[PDB]
């Protein structure tokens, strides 16, 4: 049962895991790089919000290619958890 969206999604994830494979250790209080199942984020300094271009696995990525998804890094040095503790982010720009 081919799922073309899933296959492209697995591709983006594979790509992100590696690219964060090379990047060298952080020199300050950060939020560890990660693939939060949506986008790949680098090591982000505490108390700062990170940005990324909308993921290309999205079917409408040609209409939101110029938009951004955001992910907040707390002063703790910890990424932001949604109510249930899952990976949290602002992908409003990227939505259909």
């Amino acid at each position, epitope marked *: 049962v081919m799922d073309f969206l899933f296959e492209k999604w697995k591709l983006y994830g594979d790509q992100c895991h590696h690219n964060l494979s090379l990047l060298p250790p952080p020199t300050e209080l950060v939020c560890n790089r990660t693939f939060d199942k949506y986008s790949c984020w680098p090591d982000t300094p505490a108390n700062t919000t990170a940005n990324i271009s909308c993921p290309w696995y999205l079917p409408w990525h040609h209409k939101v290619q110029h938009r951004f998804v955001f992910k907040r890094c707390g002063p703790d040095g910890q990424w932001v958890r949604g*109510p249930r503790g899952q990976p949290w982010r602002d992908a409003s720009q990227c939505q259909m």
Partner: antibody
Framework: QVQLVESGGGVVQPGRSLRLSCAAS????????MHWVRQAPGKGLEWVAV????????DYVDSVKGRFTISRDNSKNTLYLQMNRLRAEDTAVYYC?????????????????????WGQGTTVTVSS | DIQMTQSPSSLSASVGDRVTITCRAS??????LGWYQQKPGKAPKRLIY???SLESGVPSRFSGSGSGTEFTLTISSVQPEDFVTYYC?????????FGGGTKVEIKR
């Protein structure tokens, strides 16, 4: 054939620590989030802890934060609960529950469907 | 911390009557609410999930409704085995929070 069984309950004195276990069968253990729920002798239901797969997502009810630890051994489909520095408020029956989640790729949302399957439970009595 | 206010604590009913149990969430939880039945000496057993859905193998007399902040559990005609305790559970945010519970006792 999907079942949950909690064991390890008994009598333990305040200050000392106890470990609970929860065995699962009939379903794929790795694919679900597991909860602990307890109920004091004559009181209602209270949520205590929760792990998922990762286990990067563990949460606890306030009264047990820094006191209880939840963990899981997927090889033998078993959930654990470390109970430390026990006290009166811990006296209760402890259940383990199953919960399914779902990640929507297009949206990026994570959906949770609540606790659908419980175990019979096991009693913990803290007293000297 | 979402408070789950359940009413009433205990109610009065005769078998065949219509029973109504309400659950008010302090914070909006959409349809992430579920209802539970607990018989004395046994572990809880879900009846309603997603607020409005009926668990497989549960009498058609049990029905839940509502969304957001207000929820209701209904038994169109109470049955002799239905006279037991019921709990509502919110799985929207951590921590997971239950209602105080409702004990249904047969009236005489």
């Amino acid at each position: 054939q999907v079942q949950l069984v909690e064991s390890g309950g008994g009598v333990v004195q305040p200050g000392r620590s106890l470990r609970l276990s929860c065995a699962a069968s009939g379903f794929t253990f790795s694919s679900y989030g597991m909860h602990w729920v307890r109920q004091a002798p004559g009181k209602g239901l209270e949520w205590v802890a929760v792990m998922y797969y990762d286990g990067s997502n563990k949460d606890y009810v306030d009264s047990v934060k820094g006191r209880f630890t939840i963990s899981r051994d997927n090889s033998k489909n078993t959930l654990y609960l470390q109970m430390n520095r026990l006290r009166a408020e811990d006296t209760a029956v402890y259940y383990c529950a199953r919960e399914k989640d779902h990640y929507d790729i297009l949206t990026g949302y994570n959906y949770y469907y609540g606790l659908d399957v419980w175990g019979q439970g096991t009693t913990v009595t803290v007293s000297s | 911390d979402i408070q789950m206010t359940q009413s009433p604590s205990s109610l009065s009913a005769s078998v065949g009557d219509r029973v109504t149990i309400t659950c008010r969430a302090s914070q909006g939880i959409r349809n992430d609410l579920g209802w539970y039945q607990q018989k004395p000496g046994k572990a809880p057993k879900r009846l309603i999930y997603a607020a409005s859905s009926l668990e497989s193998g549960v009498p058609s007399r049990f029905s839940g409704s509502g969304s957001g902040t207000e929820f209701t559990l209904t038994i169109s005609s109470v049955q002799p085995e239905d006279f037991v305790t019921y709990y509502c559970l919110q799985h929207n945010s951590n921590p997971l929070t239950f209602g105080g519970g409702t004990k249904v006792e047969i009236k005489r």
